[PDB]
Subunit: 314 residues, 3 copies
């Protein structure tokens, strides 16, 4: 199977500059090489160049709507393209708002996909519920069918077509959630595993349940959108939104390993890696390394070890 | 429901000066305010002024018996008072010896209460078994009915009436126990979950069993006495008696969230926060912050998020 | 029961000087005294003096073969000796290559022993599969019966007799395994619990299974070879080969506590503690302290506490 890396140097989804450097930091760390050592064929499409929309006035509270909307439109085009050729896409972020384009494009080819969202936040805030106009905290709002017309159309997002329903998404690692978002998730009946369910059940059972919930009836391709801040800051400190008490390096890898085993991984997002937020070079290194670690994992690198088939090492 | 904060600036229960500053530190961090944002009605009773007993000669090994016994008599009076008006009491510590008065007062109004003791220590040492005359390591000895008359009456504690039995208490987090204390808990058949049971069962099952054990037959008010050193020093370093290998920030929150869910929380103690033992301002901040986090949790703040009823955020 | 401490100042098993200071650092921390307060009789045999083989040319890739082979022959002699007198041996190391001699000597007296290897690595690499000629990563290759004659005889190891089979060993904590080693363990059907099984099962169930696997049929003496790097670097940073995402301080103690409870502990190795690799004195202290803690644990020190029998503390 085919893997296509696509870099998304975007940061207008939030106030902290730096996430655009994320894809570079990940390649710098040898992401693309390491991936070649796996049983997959890797092709590095490169980084997308996003055209900046001049005079991008805020829509009410929402900041940089047109710039974010346009970059996402371009990214959904690219993703739809590679998905069509039957390759597995891997989007290196930039902030999480780029999940809009990543999942939209993916859905065009695989309309029956399900989403596993690893994050400390829901990021379902609608343009009306945000306390800040930051779009990196609103991705899911634009993607839900049940949230259609529950908010004003925003400049630059008219191309977006609400692709997945509340029954197709599962959250894991939810700790920081706004009142509005919590209202939405309870009202729409969205399945989630906040850190308290992870504590109660154990990562092992959590994955067992998200799979029986999303794949019980029909087996369908999976889109894993991963916000590095879904891990405790002790593992991924270089992110704009650190929340203590998150997933452990082990639980993170555990998930990726289980998802690899389903054989259904179809799309992946490695978001919110911000190199400039590390208080020491080591903090940046720590963050990058585990992100690379989760990616390689999604693809077969097991902690128990790997050996090439047909090779008699004796 | 009513919440009444009562500050207990006491430190004579142990050697290290500093725990008296505990209540101030917690208030500084915005405890009383944040609590106001919850669905509860909050009233801050202020800090109690403890009269120092001059010429407080040690009783054999026990230090400051009269000073400790008196303050505790004063605290029990205040607690019995607020409990009577049907409010939930929250005692901010000083050292853990103040649990004597907190639980005594509480039992006067709710004689059928049960106690969940989160600590790395049992603190059941009797005046005869202590290696140090420190009273912060002897609270439970004065409260157990089964320990009545097994030790000499101590100056200043004649007002205390053994209120709970060995069947009404459950320990969680035990990791540093003295030979004598261990003898006591084994002999009296006190239920406990040391770190090895937590490792074996998982905090989830642990809480399940402490509830079926204490509430299986009769539903009764709960008194949660939390010794901040119950968590690993990595989360609550500013305490006088840190023991490695303790409860994780997540497990602590998990316990409080489950106790909130029972709807039976009646009394709470946030003990042993010593601001002066932090080896960096950050270590003190870390400690205070999680203590506050625990409190807020004991009152409804969920990691999955909280939203106000009847408010349509859309 | 008899305890005999045997120091193994060895470091030629790998490139990083410093592990020879391991036994000194451990005694320095009060290991031998502390172990005295336990219910066991302790005898400190001292540190073995290893004769350095001059003109120790590499055997193909393998470095210091003769020096390592000779030191191990001497250690096996000493261990066979104490085991014979019916005492429990405790080898303080240097590098893990000294497991060859420790287990060989042990097997001479107890041929039906089983081995519980706690390490982040397998260390089964054969002289032909090593990427480096380092022997600390080859111990198990020399001990397996199934690996006999699968590699050239090495200068200095002719005295070694493959004592245990693939059915007699269980790995716990595996996270860093080479392709070759992975091939070997899969091919030979060796039971192991890599970090992912620990994640999935929980340390509690893992121990349950390693015991039903190794002791289900016949109860036999247990040799616990503990590589300190089997725990996460956050607990044992002063080692030559740290791998992130390992066993927690709690899980480590949980293992030793369960092993103590079987009553079958016969041999023990506390390997890879390298004092000179600590980036701060605190890191060295942290490492030593937990190594000491694990040892004391193997011999009865419980987290729930201990009390001497027949002593009425009341
Ligand atoms: Mn986030
Ligand atoms: Mn996100
Ligand atoms: Mn304590
Ligand atoms: Mn206490
Ligand atoms: Mn190792
Ligand atoms: Mn080893």
């Amino acid at each position: 199977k085919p893997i296509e890396i696509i870099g998304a140097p975007f940061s207008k989804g939030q106030p902290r500059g730096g996430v655009e450097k994320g894809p570079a930091a990940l390649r710098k760390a040898g992401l693309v090489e390491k991936l070649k050592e796996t049983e997959y064929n890797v092709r590095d499409h490169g980084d997308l160049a996003f055209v900046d929309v001049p005079n991008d006035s805020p829509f009410q509270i929402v900041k940089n709507p047109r710039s974010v909307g346009k970059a996402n439109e371009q990214l959904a085009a690219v993703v739809a393209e590679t998905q069509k050729n039957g390759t597995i896409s891997v989007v290196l972020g930039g902030d999480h708002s780029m999940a809009i384009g990543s999942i939209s494009g993916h859905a065009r080819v695989h309309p029956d996909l399900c989403v596993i969202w690893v994050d400390a936040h829901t990021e379902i805030n609608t343009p009306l519920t945000t306390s800040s106009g930051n779009l990196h905290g609103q991705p899911v709002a634009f993607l839900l069918k049940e949230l259609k017309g529950k908010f004003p159309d925003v400049p630059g997002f008219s191309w977006v077509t609400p692709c997945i329903s509340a029954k197709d998404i599962v959250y894991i690692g939810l700790r920081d959630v706004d009142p509005g978002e919590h209202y939405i998730i309870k009202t729409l009946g969205i399945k989630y595993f906040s850190m308290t369910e992870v504590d109660k059940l154990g990562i092992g059972k959590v994955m067992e349940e998200t799979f029986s919930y999303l794949l019980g009836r029909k087996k369908r391709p999976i889109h894993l959108s991963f916000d590095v801040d879904g891990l405790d800051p002790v593992f991924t400190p270089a992110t704009g939104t650190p929340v203590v008490g998150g997933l452990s390096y082990r639980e993170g890898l555990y998930i990726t390993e289980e998802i690899y085993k389903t054989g259904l991984l179809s799309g992946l997002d490695i978001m919110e890696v911000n190199p400039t937020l590390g208080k020491t070079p080591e903090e940046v290194t720590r963050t990058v390394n585990t992100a690379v670690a989760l990616t390689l994992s999604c693809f077969g690198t097991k902690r128990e070890g790997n050996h090439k088939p047909e090779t008699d090492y004796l």
